[PDB]
Amino acid sequence: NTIRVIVSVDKAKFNPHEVLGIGGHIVYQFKLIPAVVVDVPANAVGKLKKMPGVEKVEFDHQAVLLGKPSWQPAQTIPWGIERVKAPSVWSITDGSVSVIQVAVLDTGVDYDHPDLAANIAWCVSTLRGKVSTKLRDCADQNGHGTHVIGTIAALNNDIGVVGVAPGVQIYSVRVLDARGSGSYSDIAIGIEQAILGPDGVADKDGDGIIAGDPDDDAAEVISMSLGGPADDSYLYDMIIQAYNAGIVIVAASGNEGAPSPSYPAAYPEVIAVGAIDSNDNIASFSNRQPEVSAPGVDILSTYPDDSYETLMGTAMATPHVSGVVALIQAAYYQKYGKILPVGTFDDISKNTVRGILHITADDLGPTGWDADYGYGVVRAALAVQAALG
Ligand SMILES: [Ca+2]
Ligand SMILES: [Ca+2]
Ligand SMILES: [Ca+2]
Ligand SMILES: [Ca+2]
Ligand SMILES: [Ca+2]
Ligand SMILES: [Ca+2]
Ligand SMILES: [Ca+2]
């Protein structure tokens, strides 16, 4: 009965052979942070902590999906896509700018869904600490991933639905199992994979440009429709690698009606996303103090197997924002041959992605940022306009 823990280490002194020596093993060595996921006897963690080079031993917490199913063959435009004013942007860009990819860390994807396939660029899985690019492993066993993905990127054609950014390339990174449950360790490995991309190297040409570099295959957005209450240092360390790579990170605020967002949404470097309904009210389940809000009730999208389904949750709101991000970056790159900086929470200018989102958002409720809606409901068209402005 080994348990899985995540060790933060000093690479000069940590000796993995010591871990094998007490009956453990290394499951995954992070490429971008100094840490290793290890399996070891519970009764032997006492020892691990004492080994040379072991700075911290964190247990493997759990996060869960933040969407649930709610209780025409020709294409429907789901109401939320219209709410966030995406279709008007498509004349400028549908997100099909070659350097732009959106990584969706979720339950996997129905990679061959006729309304998604053309936009699935890379389908990968990190479950149990093993990185697999086998399609069987990257397929969705829950449906939630396929639905989230569809809200970002379902194709604009004569069937099904249509995403916020219906031409954007998607990386499906499976970090959640069939029940929508995920280990923090897998989720961290998944954020790492979104950075590394298909070629396995963060900055291949070593110019210090990752996101926005056409010579690399890093994602530009990481979208996490999932959350947990634990705040673990190695996971935050990974979020910072991604942020430092120029990648915009977006995550669901959570659904317990709690006064603040779950993790990773609650990190400063992450855009926490709250849920509204078709009446512009905040849903009661929506965790407070989000950064922005978006449609998250009665959301129709793609679902396995080659089907459609209506779900609800902050998980559903999240992809609407990620899709807006993808339109911003795509239109800005299309015009300027570069992307914009990610920005911070406080940001109120047009020179960062986050500043654009905050200043163009539809400010419902009490004037300015407020604990229900954040800065407001994201608006694609106005955002792209500020971007190109
Ligand atoms: Ca890219
Ligand atoms: Ca469609
Ligand atoms: Ca790469
Ligand atoms: Ca580079
Ligand atoms: Ca380059
Ligand atoms: Ca299918
Ligand atoms: Ca407000």
Q: Give, as one character, the DSSP assignment of residue 342.
A: -
Q: What is the DSSP string of 276-334?
A: E-TTSPBPTTSPSS-SEEEE-SSEEEEETTTEEEEEESHHHHHHHHHHHHHHHHHHHHH
Ion ligand 4 nearby residues (CB, 5 A): 203, 205, 207, 209, 213, 216
Interval between CA 228 and ligand 3 midpoint (Å) = 28
Interval between CA 60 and ligand 3 midpoint (Å) = 27
Query: What is the CB neighbour count within 10 angstroms for residue 256?
Result: 15
User: Under 8 Å CB-to-CB from 353, ≥6 apart: which residues?
Assistant: 248, 325, 328, 329, 340, 341, 342, 343
User: Under 8 Å CB-to-CB from 238, ≥6 apart: which residues?
Assistant: 30, 32, 33, 188, 191, 192
Q: Give, as one character, the DSSP assignment of residue 340.
A: P
Which tokens hold the place of 84? Answer: 């966030």
Nearest-CA neighbor of 263 among 305, 298, 232? 232
* Resolution expressed in Å: 1.9
Phi–psi pair at 10, nearest 5 degrees: -100, 110
Is residue 160 a contact partner of residue 210, using CB atoms and an 8 Å limit? no
One-letter identity of residue 316: M
Q: Strand ranges (DSSP E) for the chain?
A: 2-9, 25-29, 35-41, 54-59, 62-65, 68-69, 101-106, 120-125, 169-174, 181-183, 221-224, 226-227, 248-252, 270-276, 292-295, 299-303, 307-312
Interval between CA 322 and ligand 1 midpoint (Å) = 14
Interval between CA 104 and ligand 6 midpoint (Å) = 18
Tell me which ligand sits closest to the C-alpha of residue 135. 6
The C-alpha atoms of residue 233 and residue 57 are separated, in whole angstroms, by: 10
Tell me which ligand sits closest to the C-alpha of residue 74. 2
What are 118-122's contacts with CB under 8 Å, separation 24+? Answer: 118/155, 119/153, 119/155, 119/163, 119/166, 119/167, 119/168, 119/169, 119/170, 120/170, 120/172, 121/169, 121/170, 121/171, 122/171, 122/172, 122/197, 122/198
The crossing angle, in degrees rounded to 10, of helices 380-387 and 353-360 is 130
Q: For the sheet containing 62-65, what is the strand order? A: 181-183, 62-65, 226-227
Interval between CA 8 and ligand 5 midpoint (Å) = 31
Could you give the angle at the alpha carbon of 146 between the alpha carbons of 77 and 173, nearest 5°?
130
The C-alpha atoms of residue 91 and residue 358 are separated, in whole angstroms, by: 23
The C-alpha atoms of residue 363 and residue 365 are separated, in whole angstroms, by: 7
Interval between CA 160 and ligand 6 midpoint (Å) = 13
Give the C-alpha distances (Å, rounded to integers) separating 297 from 58, 84, 277, 316.
36, 14, 5, 8
One-letter identity of residue 166: P
Interval between CA 215 and ligand 3 midpoint (Å) = 9
Is residue 265 a contact partner of residue 227, using CB atoms and an 8 Å limit? yes
Interval between CA 111 and ligand 6 midpoint (Å) = 6
β-pairing, 270-276 vs 248-252, is parallel
Q: Hey, what's the torsion of the CAs at 274, 250, 104, 379, to 10 degrees?
A: 70
The C-alpha atoms of residue 223 and residue 99 are separated, in whole angstroms, by: 17
Which tokens hold the place of 169? Answer: 């390339």
Interval between CA 75 and ligand 2 midpoint (Å) = 5
Interval between CA 50 and ligand 1 midpoint (Å) = 41
The C-alpha atoms of residue 175 and residue 116 are separated, in whole angstroms, by: 19
Experimental method: X-ray
User: Under 8 Å CB-to-CB from 343, ≥6 apart: which residues?
Assistant: 352, 353, 354, 355
Is residue 314 a contact partner of residue 254, using CB atoms and an 8 Å limit? yes
Nearest-CA neighbor of 333 among 347, 319, 348, 353? 353
Domains of the chain: 1-59 (3.30.70.80), 60-389 (3.40.50.200)
